[PDB]
Design a protein around this nucleic acid. Structure first.
Ligand SMILES: [Mg+2]
Ligand SMILES: [Mg+2]
Ligand SMILES: [Mg+2]
Ligand SMILES: [Mg+2]
Ligand SMILES: [Mg+2]
Ligand SMILES: [Mg+2]
Ligand SMILES: [Mg+2]
Ligand SMILES: [Mg+2]
Ligand SMILES: [Mg+2]
Ligand SMILES: [Mg+2]
Ligand SMILES: [Mg+2]
Ligand SMILES: [Mg+2]
Ligand SMILES: [Mg+2]
Ligand SMILES: [Mg+2]
Ligand SMILES: [Mg+2]
Ligand SMILES: [Mg+2]
Ligand SMILES: [Mg+2]
Ligand SMILES: [Mg+2]
Ligand SMILES: [Mg+2]
Ligand SMILES: [Mg+2]
Ligand SMILES: [Mg+2]
Ligand SMILES: [Mg+2]
Ligand SMILES: [Mg+2]
Ligand SMILES: [Mg+2]
Ligand SMILES: [Mg+2]
Ligand SMILES: [Mg+2]
Ligand SMILES: [Mg+2]
Ligand SMILES: [Mg+2]
Ligand SMILES: [Mg+2]
Ligand SMILES: [Mg+2]
Ligand SMILES: [Mg+2]
Ligand SMILES: [Mg+2]
Ligand SMILES: [Mg+2]
Ligand SMILES: [Mg+2]
Ligand SMILES: [Mg+2]
Ligand SMILES: [Mg+2]
Ligand SMILES: [Mg+2]
Ligand SMILES: [Mg+2]
Ligand SMILES: [Mg+2]
Ligand SMILES: [Mg+2]
Ligand SMILES: [Mg+2]
Ligand SMILES: [Mg+2]
Ligand SMILES: [Mg+2]
Ligand SMILES: [Mg+2]
Ligand SMILES: [Mg+2]
Ligand SMILES: [Mg+2]
Ligand SMILES: [Mg+2]
Ligand SMILES: [Mg+2]
Ligand SMILES: [Mg+2]
Ligand SMILES: [Mg+2]
Ligand SMILES: [Mg+2]
Ligand SMILES: [Mg+2]
Ligand SMILES: [Mg+2]
Ligand SMILES: [Mg+2]
Ligand SMILES: [Mg+2]
Ligand SMILES: [Mg+2]
Ligand SMILES: [Mg+2]
Ligand SMILES: [Mg+2]
Ligand SMILES: [Mg+2]
Ligand SMILES: [Mg+2]
Ligand SMILES: [Mg+2]
Ligand SMILES: [Mg+2]
Ligand SMILES: [Mg+2]
Ligand SMILES: [Mg+2]
Ligand SMILES: [Mg+2]
Ligand SMILES: [Mg+2]
Ligand SMILES: [Mg+2]
Ligand SMILES: [Mg+2]
Ligand SMILES: [Mg+2]
Ligand SMILES: [Mg+2]
Ligand SMILES: [Mg+2]
Ligand SMILES: [Mg+2]
Ligand SMILES: [Mg+2]
Ligand SMILES: [Mg+2]
Ligand SMILES: [Mg+2]
Ligand SMILES: [Mg+2]
Ligand SMILES: [Mg+2]
Ligand SMILES: [Mg+2]
Ligand SMILES: [Mg+2]
Ligand SMILES: [Mg+2]
Ligand SMILES: [Mg+2]
Ligand SMILES: [Mg+2]
Ligand SMILES: [Mg+2]
Ligand SMILES: [Mg+2]
Ligand SMILES: [Mg+2]
Ligand SMILES: [Mg+2]
Ligand SMILES: [Mg+2]
Ligand SMILES: [Mg+2]
Ligand SMILES: [Mg+2]
Ligand SMILES: [Mg+2]
Ligand SMILES: [Mg+2]
Ligand SMILES: [Mg+2]
Ligand SMILES: [Mg+2]
Ligand SMILES: [Mg+2]
Ligand SMILES: [Mg+2]
Ligand SMILES: [Mg+2]
Ligand SMILES: [Mg+2]
Ligand SMILES: [Mg+2]
Ligand SMILES: [Mg+2]
Ligand SMILES: [Mg+2]
Ligand SMILES: [Mg+2]
Ligand SMILES: [Mg+2]
Ligand SMILES: [Mg+2]
Ligand SMILES: [Mg+2]
Ligand SMILES: [Mg+2]
Ligand SMILES: [Mg+2]
Ligand SMILES: [Mg+2]
Ligand SMILES: [Mg+2]
Ligand SMILES: [Mg+2]
Ligand SMILES: [Mg+2]
Ligand SMILES: [Mg+2]
Ligand SMILES: [Mg+2]
Ligand SMILES: [Mg+2]
Ligand SMILES: [Mg+2]
Ligand SMILES: [Mg+2]
Ligand SMILES: [Mg+2]
Ligand SMILES: [Mg+2]
Ligand SMILES: [Mg+2]
Ligand SMILES: [Mg+2]
Ligand SMILES: [Mg+2]
Ligand SMILES: [Mg+2]
Ligand SMILES: [Mg+2]
Ligand SMILES: [Mg+2]
Ligand SMILES: [Mg+2]
Ligand SMILES: [Mg+2]
Ligand SMILES: [Mg+2]
Ligand SMILES: [Mg+2]
Ligand SMILES: [Mg+2]
Ligand SMILES: [Mg+2]
Ligand SMILES: [Mg+2]
Ligand SMILES: [Mg+2]
Ligand SMILES: [Mg+2]
Lengths: 88, 59
RNA sequence: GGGGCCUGACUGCGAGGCCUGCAAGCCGAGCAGGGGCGAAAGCCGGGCCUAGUGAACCGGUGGUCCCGUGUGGAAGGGCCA
RNA sequence: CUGGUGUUGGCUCUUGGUCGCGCCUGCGUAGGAUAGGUGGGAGCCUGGCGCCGGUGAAAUCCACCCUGGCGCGGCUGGGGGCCUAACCCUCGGAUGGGGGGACAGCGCUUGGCGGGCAGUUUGACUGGGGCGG
RNA sequence: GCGUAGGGUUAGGCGGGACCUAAGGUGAAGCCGAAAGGCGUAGCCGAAGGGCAGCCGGUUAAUAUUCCGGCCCUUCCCGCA
RNA sequence: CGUAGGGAAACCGAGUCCGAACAGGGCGCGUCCGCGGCCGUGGACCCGAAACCGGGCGAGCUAGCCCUGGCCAGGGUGAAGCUGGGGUGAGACCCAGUGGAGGCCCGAACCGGUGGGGGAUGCAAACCCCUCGGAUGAGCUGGGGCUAGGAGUGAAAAGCUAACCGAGCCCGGAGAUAGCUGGUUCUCCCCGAAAUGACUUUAGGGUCAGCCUCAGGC
RNA sequence: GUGGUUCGUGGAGCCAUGGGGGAAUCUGGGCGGACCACCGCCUAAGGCUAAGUACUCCGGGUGACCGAUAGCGCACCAGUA
RNA sequence: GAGCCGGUAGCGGGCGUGGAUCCCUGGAUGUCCGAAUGGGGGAACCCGGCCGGCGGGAACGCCGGUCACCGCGCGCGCGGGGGGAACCUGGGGAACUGAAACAUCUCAGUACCCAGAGGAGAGGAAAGAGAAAUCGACUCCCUGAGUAGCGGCGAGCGAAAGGGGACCAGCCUAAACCGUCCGGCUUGUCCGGGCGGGGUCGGGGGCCCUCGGCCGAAUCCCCAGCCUAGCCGAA
RNA sequence: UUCAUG
RNA sequence: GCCCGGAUAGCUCAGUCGGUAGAGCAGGGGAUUUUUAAUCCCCGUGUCCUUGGUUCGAUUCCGAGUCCGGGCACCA
RNA sequence: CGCGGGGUGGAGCAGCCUGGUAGCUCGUCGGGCUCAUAACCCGAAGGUCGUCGGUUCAAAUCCGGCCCCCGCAACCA
């Protein structure tokens, strides 16, 4: 997917099982295949002027923290570079 | 999610009525319609900079 | 076959063998604890005998003077059933 | 495909667990008598007795309240709406206009369906092998 | 037609490029992908398709719509009207 | 490493453990090199797979499609129309003419390959001759392009995809694996088997015992 | 929900983190292998940090390394025909 | 320091003890392609624009500059782009094999692909390790040890502590607070934004009055020494 | 209102 | 292996949320009866699974046990 | 030629549970109805349970095995 303020997606195994499970009886595993857990992504739209992010939606309050700002500069037309490099 | 209210609204009305609205209600209606701001500590003392200039300065 | 009394269809072991490629399988006098039966000698560690079964592993269940990840304890293990 | 939550909101109409609240509920007898279970048991309104007498248990008053049901409300879980701001599709290009609309899309996760795809297994003696045993 | 050496391929007009697009590429913008990259608007590339000014004869050992002979024609630039 | 071992362990110790047991029984004392035999993991004695997977390279053959060009000699049948006539109330309809339609007919190029013959270390890793099928169409073909490996493409045969496709080729994992077949290279001397039992997803293999050899002790 | 570590769900801590809930800043917070209470240990969610180590296209020397089928695939005009 | 004009052998043609040939170092020219970078491209070719130059000329020419794209700060400027036999880190990541079948597992986080980076990379100063009123960054080697363990408890995989060594080193930042300044507003004795000053278990820091106080870089110029040509070298 | 044949 | 529900007549079942035991079908008898059904009226085949227990008296409530119908779950 | 499946009343079939408790429809016989046959109604009755041998207290039941009948196979060459 993407990143915009966070780290990219990861790679998981699956690890199926078909058992009772230790606290009942004998356990097992079955098949270790690669689920590819694409991280939660939401196109958020903010009004710096018209700006759009692909933010992680556990980081929507973080991008509203980034919008609750006044970084002294007017419009070149696009400008998320000064919103993302004046991030901490 | 607490917001300081700046306008009348039905079932949450007074200015400074810091009501725990739902997050989508905050970040989708009130924040693009000016009716409320997020009640962090810095914006809470920015509210307080007006509360000190209004409430104890009418009297 | 019948009658009486019962629980030895015990717990610890077990010299010695049989057998076998190992693993298994089988017999086992004797000693102790504690009983059964009998007056006592003795016999009884399942059935007249050879079939009626299943290594391991992983679990369960009941105990246990064992281990308990610094220490006390639990989790979970072991051990015995 | 599907539930849960995320993005994901607003305002309403209704079904249970609920926390206590309480006008109230319990009825084969002998008995003024809209009869519950257990205890306090010497009366309590401006007009009602308890021992009046008989009971497995005496009643009044008043709790613990059981069994519910009725409503009054917060912790509520649901299913039905209407809205528009998320979101999506759009529109002789629009900070806007529609329309869908908290649904879809998409994230995780639960369960399912799943030869569409994949990794494999499909024993041995066997008077060849298979069938049979 | 093999070996050695030497010659030989002459274009404003023929075919391409200083022109154009088709399929398809590439691709600013924009989108999406873990990265490689995959798309994609405009644009550009893309050709025996469109468009564009030439015919006839001779010459050596080889070239000739190129060289040369005749006639014609095209673009551009400058000057005059 | 070895000097202490038992036990699952706490632990105890020439003892330990099972146990109530001071019955019984189980178990109870060298290294470092060199060299050799052998074994383990190594590719492990060498050759050889069919294959599997990763990354690439190919649609100049062929299969399809897209764009753009071309090609199809010649005859023949004679459709709809159209024209005139017949007909009728008007028509439908029916005649002649005209017209030129067709996955129409015969047929060359062209495409193909039906039957036979030749060819068979060929002329040719698919040919030649005779004969055939289509030949104005679902045609053929040049150019420009697209699609690719469990994928393309397929008027479907599992065909085609660079001369062998039930999953291309090349490199890499990779010296894959092979209980299989082949092969194993100087000389002498001594001793010398087995093809049986048990067990095997085991029957051509293996573990153990049987038979064999070597060294030591008796 | 998974990966890493010896750890394959196990008694699963720890380190990372894709989803969801979601704090405090020293009477904070994490860790000492479920967890809990004592005793310790240590400060996450910001970054840099030589040195020693791996390597060998390269240059040099070294060889109980090869001597043209060997040694690199090439001692030669070879990654050539 | 006397022969040369490369692998010369041949035209004979020159050139050198006023110093050549060579070798090293530093420049210059480096056509065209290539990250290719003006645009196109079927690489080594075409087609340009702007400026400056040669009826050589206004048209075609040629020369010499400059013309990609991206990232960083104020039209303006410094980097990046690709390559490299291996080595390394991160993102992905098999399968044959082995388990005498096989699926968990193993092969293996191997090969391979991608990114990045450099002479190394990585990691790194403790929210560490785990039994010691202990060790004190990280890395590497040997031990630990095939141990502890993990394990269809099969196949197999397999640490870490401790302990020897090498090497040695610690540091910057909001472990808040003060001023600065484009603007924020409800002109607030104030929100966040850039710096700057503070700040790094006389447990830390900022703020409040005693008792005042310089060690040394990883950074920088230096210098040996090292190479990159060689030279003298006994009989 | 049922019900086949000599 | 746990988890539900049930044991009521010859059979299938409801239970005033303790004060009375019941349907429906079957069986029989009776009425009409061309045929058999259908219809009509009336009776039963009844320790309400077994005991223990709580209550004044138990199908009801409580536990145990047995058969009894399932639901899931592993299955070394 | 080898598996597996049946044999039960005149016929077609239930069956029969570790073995002891055998039937259903039609057919049959007798009656009733009918002028008479159908149909219908009422009473019963009928079977060595494929032969055979086996363990059994006892076989139709269970174990073989043999004869008819059924369903299957009889493939790779
Ligand atoms: Mg497992
Ligand atoms: Mg695997
Ligand atoms: Mg949105
Ligand atoms: Mg007796
Ligand atoms: Mg033995
Ligand atoms: Mg034995
Ligand atoms: Mg035996
Ligand atoms: Mg016996
Ligand atoms: Mg096993
Ligand atoms: Mg520990
Ligand atoms: Mg402990
Ligand atoms: Mg014992
Ligand atoms: Mg209203
Ligand atoms: Mg009530
Ligand atoms: Mg009485
Ligand atoms: Mg009520
Ligand atoms: Mg209500
Ligand atoms: Mg409600
Ligand atoms: Mg609506
Ligand atoms: Mg709109
Ligand atoms: Mg399936
Ligand atoms: Mg398959
Ligand atoms: Mg495999
Ligand atoms: Mg066989
Ligand atoms: Mg056979
Ligand atoms: Mg020649
Ligand atoms: Mg001309
Ligand atoms: Mg031309
Ligand atoms: Mg030009
Ligand atoms: Mg062009
Ligand atoms: Mg186009
Ligand atoms: Mg593209
Ligand atoms: Mg362009
Ligand atoms: Mg052209
Ligand atoms: Mg043309
Ligand atoms: Mg010629
Ligand atoms: Mg010519
Ligand atoms: Mg002319
Ligand atoms: Mg002893
Ligand atoms: Mg040796
Ligand atoms: Mg495989
Ligand atoms: Mg390709
Ligand atoms: Mg082609
Ligand atoms: Mg085709
Ligand atoms: Mg006509
Ligand atoms: Mg015609
Ligand atoms: Mg035709
Ligand atoms: Mg063909
Ligand atoms: Mg042919
Ligand atoms: Mg023909
Ligand atoms: Mg033909
Ligand atoms: Mg034809
Ligand atoms: Mg024809
Ligand atoms: Mg024709
Ligand atoms: Mg074509
Ligand atoms: Mg082509
Ligand atoms: Mg195919
Ligand atoms: Mg082929
Ligand atoms: Mg195949
Ligand atoms: Mg393939
Ligand atoms: Mg091989
Ligand atoms: Mg391998
Ligand atoms: Mg001899
Ligand atoms: Mg074998
Ligand atoms: Mg042997
Ligand atoms: Mg011998
Ligand atoms: Mg020997
Ligand atoms: Mg374990
Ligand atoms: Mg504290
Ligand atoms: Mg922590
Ligand atoms: Mg710690
Ligand atoms: Mg913790
Ligand atoms: Mg601990
Ligand atoms: Mg470094
Ligand atoms: Mg080192
Ligand atoms: Mg050398
Ligand atoms: Mg030699
Ligand atoms: Mg030599
Ligand atoms: Mg040679
Ligand atoms: Mg060689
Ligand atoms: Mg030679
Ligand atoms: Mg060469
Ligand atoms: Mg020369
Ligand atoms: Mg000089
Ligand atoms: Mg010179
Ligand atoms: Mg020179
Ligand atoms: Mg120059
Ligand atoms: Mg260029
Ligand atoms: Mg270009
Ligand atoms: Mg070119
Ligand atoms: Mg001049
Ligand atoms: Mg000039
Ligand atoms: Mg230029
Ligand atoms: Mg600088
Ligand atoms: Mg690079
Ligand atoms: Mg595998
Ligand atoms: Mg295997
Ligand atoms: Mg296998
Ligand atoms: Mg591994
Ligand atoms: Mg370094
Ligand atoms: Mg670092
Ligand atoms: Mg530290
Ligand atoms: Mg180590
Ligand atoms: Mg250490
Ligand atoms: Mg150390
Ligand atoms: Mg130091
Ligand atoms: Mg500020
Ligand atoms: Mg500071
Ligand atoms: Mg002070
Ligand atoms: Mg100096
Ligand atoms: Mg010096
Ligand atoms: Mg030198
Ligand atoms: Mg000298
Ligand atoms: Mg000398
Ligand atoms: Mg009737
Ligand atoms: Mg009738
Ligand atoms: Mg008749
Ligand atoms: Mg008559
Ligand atoms: Mg009942
Ligand atoms: Mg009953
Ligand atoms: Mg009930
Ligand atoms: Mg009825
Ligand atoms: Mg009835
Ligand atoms: Mg009755
Ligand atoms: Mg009764
Ligand atoms: Mg009862
Ligand atoms: Mg009772
Ligand atoms: Mg089971
Ligand atoms: Mg019968
Ligand atoms: Mg019969
Ligand atoms: Mg009759
Ligand atoms: Mg056949």
């Amino acid at each position: 997917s993407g990143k915009r303020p966070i780290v990219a997606n990861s790679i998981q195994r699956r690890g199926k099982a078909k058992r009772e499970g230790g606290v009942g009886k004998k356990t097992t595993g079955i098949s270790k295949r690669r689920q590819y857990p694409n991280l939660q992504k939401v196109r958020v739209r903010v009004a710096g002027q018209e700006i759009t992010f692909r933010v992680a939606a556990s980081h929507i309050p973080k991008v509203y923290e980034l919008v609750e700002r006044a970084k002294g500069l007017k419009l070149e037309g696009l400008s998320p570079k000064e919103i993302k490099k004046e991030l901490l | 999610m607490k917001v300081i209210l700046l306008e009348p609204l039905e079932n949450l009305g007074d200015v400074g009525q810091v009501v725990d609205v739902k997050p989508g209600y905050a970040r989708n209606y009130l924040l693009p319609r000016g009716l409320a701001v997020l009640a962090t500590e810095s914006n809470l003392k920015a509210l307080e900079a007006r509360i000190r200039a209004q409430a104890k300065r009418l009297a």
